[PDB]
Design a protein around this nucleic acid. Structure first.
Lengths: 185, 185, 262, 260
RNA sequence: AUCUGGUUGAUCCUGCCAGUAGUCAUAUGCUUGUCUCAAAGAUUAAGCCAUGCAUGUCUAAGUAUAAGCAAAUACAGUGAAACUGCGAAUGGCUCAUUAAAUCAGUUAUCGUUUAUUUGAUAGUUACAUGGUAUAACUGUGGUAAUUCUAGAGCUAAUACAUGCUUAAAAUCUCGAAGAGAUGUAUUUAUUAGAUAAAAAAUUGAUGAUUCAUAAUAACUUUUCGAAUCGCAUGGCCGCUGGCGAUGGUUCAUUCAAAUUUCUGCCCUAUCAACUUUCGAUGGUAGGAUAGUGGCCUACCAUGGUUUCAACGGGUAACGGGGAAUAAGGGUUCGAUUCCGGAGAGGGAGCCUGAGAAACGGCUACCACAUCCAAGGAAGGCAGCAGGCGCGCAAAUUACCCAAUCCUAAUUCAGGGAGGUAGUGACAAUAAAUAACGAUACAGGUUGUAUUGGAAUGAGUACAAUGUAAAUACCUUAACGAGGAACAAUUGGAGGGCAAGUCUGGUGAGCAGCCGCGGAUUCCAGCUCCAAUAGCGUAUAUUAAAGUUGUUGCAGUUAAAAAGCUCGUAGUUGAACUUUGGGCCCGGUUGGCCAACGGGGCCUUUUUUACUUUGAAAAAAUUAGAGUGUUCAAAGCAGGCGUGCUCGAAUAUAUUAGCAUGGAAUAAUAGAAUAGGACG
RNA sequence: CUAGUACCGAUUGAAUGGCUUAGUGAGGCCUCAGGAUCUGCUUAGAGUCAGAGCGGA
C-alpha cells in the first residue's frame, strides 16, 4: 500500500534510482482519519508489536484546560473557526491538532461563580473562603467579554487520529490577540 | 557442510627439461641410493629450497631480535635431531651449505645397508617393503622413513618373520612337505 | 541490454518449438509405434526371456502368442511399441529384420562367450549396413553367482568387449535387477533414434496385414516412415524385385494416374 | 532473514570454546539468558569437552534430568544454558564446586573451590537508577536487579552478593591501587593494579594497569573488573596468578620441568 | 629473477613471432595394480517437469464415559480421535536483478519496537457464575472428481463470556460533627527536579535534556490486579500449612530488528551540462508510522550537483574473508564449504502472528499447463533422488537417526538438516612390476650367458575386529610365481631440445617456427632418449617480458615533438627566524672504563600534512612453535605408574576513524587609516 | 550450373520488446451504507400459549 521508503526518491544530485527490492512490511503507512463532529464512533487498529491505536471518526465532547485557573472540565465542542494548514478543513469542520474551535462556556462559569462567589458577567463556611480568594478574582477583559455569548475560543492539543480523543486549552493571552487579528482579517 | 580438509603439493619440476648436464647428475644419485624416480629427487630439493628461504629471511633480522632467537633455534634444533646437520656446525650460517646428499644419507633404506643386514641398496629396499625390518617394536615398511639419531640402536629384524625367529615362509614349508611325503614313499 | 536479452529469448522459443515438432510423431496412442528388434548373440539365451523380463516392469499384466510380431501399448509411459523377433536360423533374415528397426537390443550371455564364427559376424555386418540405435542387455548373470562381486567381475568384462564395437556406449544393463530393466524400458519409450541416411530418403512401410486380389492386386496396410510416397512411384520388395502400385488410400484414395514411370 | 536465527554453524562459534573442526557440521547455540552469547559457556561444552564426564550429547541430557547440576544454587536442565564469568557450578554427588574464571590464555579454566567460597559471587555495577514509586535499584553484569542499594554505590563499582537470599553484603569503590581483572580484548585474563584513568568526554575512557612484574598495558574501561584491594583478592585466583609470560620463558620452563 | 631460435651473398640494430614452466582452469585422447583423502548440472536455458519423500509435537502436572486395551461408586493404569497451547519467519537452494546501491572497517538511538530466557514487581476493585456452545462421537445424505462438506441429536476447558472476597494511618475538598476521594494503565494542561561568594534599609545521573521520578485538576468508548493443575498430609482444639506447574502489569537483561555518521568500486567524452509539470533543494503547520525525515498534503521561497568528470551508456557485475603466479613492485580471478544481500515462472495485493509484504499461506491479472461424465476441479523441484531439453561440459528414483545439532506440551516423538554406502584418473599423500648364490667366459672385485634354494602381496578365504546393520581398511588359519603370460604405458630421434653416416621401400606425407621430399625430417623394422601409473592435445591466464615501463621503455635518420604565440583549470615554485656551550642523573652491551641510547638543571629562555607507540581489524585460509598419524598429505592431539599430568602458542592484516610521543621537511595566520600589547 | 555473401525492399504476412497519445480497469484494504438470520430484557400470552417495545452479534 502506502510506503514510507526513501528508495523511490531522486538522489540529491538529481540521479534516478533503480528498484532495489520489493516493498517491505515494516515500512508501511495508512489512510487518514479525517475526524468530524458528530456522535462518538471509534475504531481500533492492530499495530506493530501487537499494540493498539484508536482511530476516532466522530466526536462531540472533550477535556479542556483553564490554564491560568488550573482546572479542567469536560465540555461540548461547537465548531471549527480557523486552521493554519488548510482552509478546506474549516469548511468541513474537520478536527486535527492545532485547530481553533469554539466550546460551550457554561461548565466554566458554574465553577467560577461558586469558587470566587462573584458573578462573571450565604453561610459562614462559604463567606470565609470567598474573602480569602477575593484578591485573585480579576480576569482578562478579552476573556470575560466572551462569556456573554456562551462560547470560548480553544486550541486542540491532542492528536485525534492517533489516540481517539480531543483535548485542548482556552486561548488566554498574546495568543488570543494574534488569532483575533487573523480571524477578523 | 563440514569444514574443508586442507592439502598441499610436495614437489617441484625443473624449469628447463633438457639441460644435459643436470640429467647426468641426477642419474648418479638414483644409481647410488637406489631410487626409482626423479620425483624422489625433486621432493628433497623442494624441501631444501624452503629451509634456505626461511633461514635467509632470518639473517636480515638483527642479532638479539627476539624472533630470530626463537625461530632460528627451533630450526637448528630440528635438523640436528635427524642428523642432517652436525652438532659441530650448530650455527645458522651453515644451514645455507647443506646439499641433497645430506638428506638421502638418512633414509631408512640406506641405513639398513650401512649397518649390514642387507648387502646392497637394492637388497635393502626389498627387505623393508616385505616387512622384515623393525625400529623398536614397530614394523616399518616405508623406505623414505627418516631415522632420528636415537633410533639407530634399535634397527633389527622383526619378531614375526624368518630371519627374526618365526616359522619358515610359505615356500620353504611346501618344499619340506613334498620331500617328507616323498621320503615316506 | 534489453534488446540483447529479447533476441536470445525469442531464439530459444524457436528451438523449443522445433523440438516439439520432432516429438509429435511418437506422442501417444494416436501416434506411430516404435520398432524394436531383439537379437540374441548366443543360442543359449532364447529371445523370449529378454522380452518377458522387459514386460514385467511395465507393471500391467494385461500386457502379458503363436507369433513373432507383437503390438503393445504401455500405460506407464503412454507409448506404442512394435516388437519384431527374427528367425535366428536364417542369417540373411536377421539383416533384413534389423535393417528396419529403430532400436536393436543385443542379448549377451554371462555363461558362454560369443563365438567368432557366427556371433561376431552378426555385429560386424550390422554396423556396416548402419544401425539406428543400439542397447546392450544381460539377462542371466545370476547363473554364475557366488557373490555378486563375482557377477561384477563378469559384467566389467562384457562392457569392455561391447564398447569395442559401440564406443558411444559405456553401460550394459542387467535385467535381473528391477532398477536396470525399468531404466531400459523408459529409454525405449522416451528417447528418439538416430536417422538412417540411405533409408529415410526413401519411403518404407511395414505390413500390418496383407491381402490378395486378381495378375494379382496385393493389398498392404501399415504406417509410412520414410520421406513419403506418391502413387506414381515404383516399389521394391527385397526378395522379389520391382513392382508398380496402382492405388493408395488413407485409413481419401489416390490412384496411379498413368503420367508415371514404367 | 524474517526473524531470529536458531542455528550456529561450526567455525562461526567462539574460538575460545576449542571445538575441533571435523567432528560435525554444527555447534551448540546458547539460549537467551544472563550472559551475552559471544562470551558465555554452554553447559554441554563444560560437562563433555572439559570434565570428560559425558561421551555424547545424549549422555549430557541424562545427567541434567536427574537434577545433579545446579548453577548459582538453582537447578538447571537446559543443555545450552549460558553460564558465564564468575558463576559458581556445583555437582552435589562427587562433592565438587567450580568457579568460572579465565586462564591467562583467555580460556575458561577448570578451577576448584571450597564448600565455603561457594556461598557468594562478585558483581560489577552497570547502572543505578530510581524505579517506580521512587525506589532505587542497581543492575549487575549478570543481570540481577537489587532493591535499596547503599547510597554510596556508583557505576563501575563492584558488589558482593550472597547466593542465598540474593542481597548485597559488601562493596568496593573503583579507585587507584585496586586489583583488577581484565575481561575482554587482547589482554583478556591479565591481573594488575590501577595506575590512573583517562577521561574522554563523549568517547571511551582508558585505564593504565601495572602487574606485579611491573609490566604496563592499557585497556578500555569497559574491559576492567575490580576484584579487591592490593594484594588481597576477594576470591581465590586460578593457578599462575594471571602473570603473562613471553614465549621464550614458557619454552624454558617446560623443558626444565617437563623435560627435566 | 637475469633463457634459446627466426629479416644481407657476408653484419649490427629496432621489432614482433616461435619455443619453455605453472594453474584448488575447464574439456578431451590413449593407458590403468595397492593404501589414505576428496570436488561433482555454476558457464549454455533464474529453461520445462511424471512419481515418492522433505514439519510437526504430551509430561506426575489444560480437556477422557472410545460402546479402545488392561487389570478408591464422581474420577484415579495405558491410550486412538478431537479441542486447546506452541512451532511452521530457522534450515536447505540459487546468483537473475543491482555501480554510492549492496558490502567492509568505524559510529549513533537524548529517534524506536522486541515472543522467549534471567532478575525484580499489584492489601485499594465466593464453600466457586452462564451458555448468548461446540468438536471428536451417534445417525440420515449429496457429487465423475479433491486434505469437498450439508441437515439432525449429545457433552468438556488454562477455549469463550461474566463477576466477588483481606490491615491501619495520613492528607485534601465540602461542611458542628460528619460526608466524600486516593492502586495501575490511557490523554491533556500546570508544578518540582536547587547550587561560584557576604551585609543591610531536603534534593539522583549525564559532555549535554522538556532525563529518571514525584505532585495537582480532570479524562477512557474503561487496560491489569489468579472462578487453573500435580505431589505430599503436617500444626493447633474447624481453623491453619509445605514443595512445584501454568498464567499476568510494569521495569531491567538476553536473542534480535529498523534507521544512521565517516572514507573506500570496473569501462566509456563517437555521453558537458543535469534536476523542478507529476517533490527537484529549503521553511512553517498537519497527517501517517513502532519512531526520525518531502515519507505524504497545504502555503511560501528559488534552490541542489559538475572538468577534483556531474548526468547518460556498458558490464559474458551479487559484495567481502579469499585463489593462482614467489627477487621487489604488480597482473588476473572470486557462481561455489564462513559472514552480509536478494529471489522462489512474471508483476501487484493481503490475512494470521512478537516476527512475513511468506510462496512445501491465500487473492487477482499475464504466460504456460493437468484431470473430466464437458457441469466443473486442481497447479509452481533455483529442497533430496529422478526425467526431457541444451551443450565442449557434471553421480543412486539406495540405508539410518548411531554421531553433530534443532524444534515441540518434551530424557522417549520428528528431522532427504545431517550422517553411511554407490558412482568418481577434478586436484592431493605413500608406493609393486623382483632380490641373491653357483657354473662357464672376460676384466681386475666388475661385466656377458646354463643352473639352484629362499622371500613376498596382488588375489581368494575360516575367524575376530569394525558398524545403527553392513562393505572396506588394520589383524589372521588355509591356498596363492619362472618366459615369475601375475607380460607398463605416452610421446620423440635436422635445429630450438635429450637421443640414429642403421636398414628396406617410395619419389603421397611431415612440420607450432626455420625446414625435409621429384629421404638423417615421409612409410616400415631394429636400436636409442625423456617423463612414468601416468602422458599428450585445444582454449584462457601468469611468469620469462624493461612489448604498458611509479620502481622501469621510446620519439635526428627505425612507430612517435603539435605550423607559431597567448592563456583558465591542473602539476610545480629562491634564501632567511634558538645556535652553540656548560653541570647532574642515567639504562644496555662489552671490558672502575668505552661505546650507544635517554632524562633533568643553568646560560636574556592559530590550523594542517608527515612519522613513532597503543587499542581495534570474526573463524577457516597464509606464515609459524610442539607432537614417531608405521613415514607423509593431515589431525589437535597426547604422555607417565600398569591413578597422576603438559597442551590447544605466536605473527601478519594497505586505507579511513580513535588515543599518544616528536617538531626536521612542506603549507597557513598575526601589530602599518595601530582599530595593537601589558595598565 | 552450383556454392558462399549482402542489400534494400512487398505483405504487418505474424509475431516479440522498449517509449508514448487516448480510453478502460481485476483484486484485497480503509470508509458511507444495508440487515438473510440468531439472541438478552420488558408492562403483557398460560397454571408454550401471543403481540409490542428496548438492546447485542
Amino acid at each position: 500500500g502506502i510506503s514510507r521508503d526513501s528508495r523511490h526518491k531522486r538522489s540529491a544530485t538529481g540521479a534516478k534510482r533503480a528498484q532495489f527490492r520489493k516493498k517491505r512490511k515494516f515500512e508501511l503507512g495508512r489512510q487518514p482519519a479525517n475526524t468530524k463532529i458528530g456522535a462518538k464512533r471509534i475504531h481500533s487498529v492492530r499495530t506493530r508489536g501487537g499494540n493498539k491505536k484508536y482511530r476516532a471518526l466522530r466526536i462531540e465532547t472533550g477535556n479542556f484546560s483553564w490554564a491560568s485557573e488550573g482546572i479542567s472540565k469536560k465540555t461540548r465542542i461547537a465548531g471549527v473557526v480557523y486552521h493554519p494548514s488548510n482552509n478546506e478543513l474549516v469548511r468541513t469542520n474537520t478536527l486535527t491538532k492545532a485547530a481553533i474551535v469554539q466550546i460551550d462556556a457554561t461548565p466554566f462559569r458554574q465553577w467560577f461563580e461558586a469558587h470566587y462567589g462573584q458573578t462573571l458577567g450565604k453561610s459562614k463556611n462559604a463567606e470565609r473562603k470567598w474573602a480569602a480568594r477575593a484578591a485573585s478574582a480579576k480576569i482578562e477583559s478579552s476573556v470575560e467579554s466572551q462569556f456573554s455569548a456562551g462560547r470560548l475560543y480553544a486550541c486542540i492539543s491532542s492528536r485525534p487520529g492517533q489516540s481517539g480523543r480531543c483535548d485542548g486549552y482556552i486561548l488566554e493571552g498574546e495568543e488570543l490577540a494574534f488569532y483575533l487579528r487573523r480571524l477578523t482579517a | 557442510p563440514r569444514a574443508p580438509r586442507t592439502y598441499s603439493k610436495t614437489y617441484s619440476t625443473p624449469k628447463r627439461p633438457y639441460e644435459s648436464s643436470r640429467l647426468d647428475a641426477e642419474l648418479k644419485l638414483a644409481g647410488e641410493f637406489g631410487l626409482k624416480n626423479k620425483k624422489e629427487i625433486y621432493r628433497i630439493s623442494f624441501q631444501l629450497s624452503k629451509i634456505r628461504r626461511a633461514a635467509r629471511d632470518l639473517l636480515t633480522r638483527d642479532e638479539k631480535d627476539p624472533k630470530r632467537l626463537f625461530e632460528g633455534n627451533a630450526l637448528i634444533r630440528r635438523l640436528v635431531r635427524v642428523g642432517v646437520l652436525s652438532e659441530d656446525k650448530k650455527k645458522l650460517d651453515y644451514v645455507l651449505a647443506l646439499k641433497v646428499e645430506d638428506f638421502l644419507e638418512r633414509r631408512l633404506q640406506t641405513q639398513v645397508y650401512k649397518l649390514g643386514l642387507a648387502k646392497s641398496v637394492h637388497h635393502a629396499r626389498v627387505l623393508i617393503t616385505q616387512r622384515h625390518i623393525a625400529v623398536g617394536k614397530q614394523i616399518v615398511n616405508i623406505p623414505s622413513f627418516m631415522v632420528r639419531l636415537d633410533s639407530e640402536k634399535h634397527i633389527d629384524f622383526a619378531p614375526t618373520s624368518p630371519f627374526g625367529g618365526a616359522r619358515p615362509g610359505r615356500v620353504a614349508r611346501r618344499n619340506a612337505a613334498r620331500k617328507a611325503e616323498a621320503s615316506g614313499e | 541490454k534489453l534488446q540483447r536479452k529479447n533476441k536470445a529469448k525469442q531464439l530459444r522459443a524457436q528451438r523449443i518449438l522445433d523440438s516439439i515438432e520432432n516429438r509429435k510423431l511418437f506422442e501417444g496412442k494416436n501416434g506411430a509405434a516404435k520398432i524394436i528388434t531383439i537379437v540374441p548373440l548366443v543360442n543359449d539365451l532364447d529371445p523370449l526371456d529378454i522380452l518377458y523380463k522387459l514386460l514385467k516392469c511395465a507393471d500391467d499384466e494385461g500386457i502379458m502368442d503363436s507369433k513373432r510380431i507383437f503390438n503393445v501399448h504401455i500405460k506407464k509411459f503412454k507409448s506404442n511399441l512394435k516388437i519384431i523377433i527374427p528367425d535366428m536360423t536364417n542369417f540373411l533374415n536377421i539383416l533384413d529384420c534389423a535393417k528396419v528397426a529403430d532400436f536393436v537390443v543385443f542379448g549377451l550371455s554371462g555363461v558362454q562367450e560369443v563365438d567368432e564364427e557366427f556371433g561376431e559376424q552378426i555385429i560386424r555386418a550390422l554396423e556396416l549396413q548402419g544401425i539406428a540405435s543400439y542397447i546392450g542387455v544381460i539377462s542371466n548373470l545370476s547363473a554364475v553367482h557366488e557373490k555378486e562381486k563375482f557377477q561384477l567381475d563378469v559384467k566389467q568384462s562384457l562392457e569392455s568387449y561391447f564398447k569395442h564395437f559401440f564406443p558411444s556406449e559405456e553401460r550394459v544393463y542387467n535385467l535381473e535387477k528391477n532398477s536396470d530393466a525399468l531404466n531400459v524400458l523408459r529409454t525405449l519409450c522416451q528417447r528418439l533414434p538416430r536417422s538412417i541416411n540411405w533409408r529415410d530418403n526413401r519411403g518404407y512401410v511395414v505390413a500390418d496385414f496383407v491381402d490378395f486380389v486378381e495378375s494379382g492386386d496385393l493389398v498392404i496396410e501399415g504406417t509410412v516412415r520414410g520421406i513419403g510416397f506418391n502413387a506414381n512411384r515404383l516399389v521394391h520388395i527385397p526378395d522379389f524385385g520391382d513392382f508398380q502400385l496402382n492405388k493408395i488410400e488413407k485409413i481419401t484414395v489416390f490412384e496411379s494416374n498413368m503420367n508415371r514411370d514404367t | 532473514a524474517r526473524g531470529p536465527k536458531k542455528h550456529l554453524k561450526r567455525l562461526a562459534a567462539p574460538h575460545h570454546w576449542l571445538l575441533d573442526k571435523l567432528s560435525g557440521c554444527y555447534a551448540p547455540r546458547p539460549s537467551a539468558g544472563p550472559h551475552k552469547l559471544r562470551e558465555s559457556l554452554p553447559l554441554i561444552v563444560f560437562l563433555r569437552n572439559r570434565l570428560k564426564y559425558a561421551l555424547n550429547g545424549r549422555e549430557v541430557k541424562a545427567i541434567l534430568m536427574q537434577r545433579h547440576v545446579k548453577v548459582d544454587g538453582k537447578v538447571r536442565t537446559d543443555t545450552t544454558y549460558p553460564a558465564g564469568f564468575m558463576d559458581v557450578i556445583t555437582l552435589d554427588a562427587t562433592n565438587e564446586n567450580f568457579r568460572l574464571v579465565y586462564d591467562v590464555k583467555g580460556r575458561f579454566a577448570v578451577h576448584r573451590i571450597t564448600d565455603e567460597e561457594a556461598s557468594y559471587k562478585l558483581g560489577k555495577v552497570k547502572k543505578v537508577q530510581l524505579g517506580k514509586k521512587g525506589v532505587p535499584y542497581v543492575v549487575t553484569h549478570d543481570g540481577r536487579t537489587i532493591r535499596y542499594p547503599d547510597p554510596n554505590i556508583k557505576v563501575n563499582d563492584t558488589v558482593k552478593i550472597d547466593l542465598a537470599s540474593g542481597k548485597i553484603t559488601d562493596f568496593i569503590k573503583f579507585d587507584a591501587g585496586k586489583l583488577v581483572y581484565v575481561t575482554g580484548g587482547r589482554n583478556l585474563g591479565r591481573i594488575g593494579t590501577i595506575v590512573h584513568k583517562e577521561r574522554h568526554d563523549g568517547g571511551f575512557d582508558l585505564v593504565h594497569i601495572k602487574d606485579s612484574l611491573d609490566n604496563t598495558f592499557v585497556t578500555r574501561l569497559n574491559n576492567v573488573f575490580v576484584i579487591g584491594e592490593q594484594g588481597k583478592p576477594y576470591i581465590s585466583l586460578p593457578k599462575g596468578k594471571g602473570i603473562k609470560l613471553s614465549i621464550a620463558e614458557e619454552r624454558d620452563r617446560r623443558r626444565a620441568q617437563q623435560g627435566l
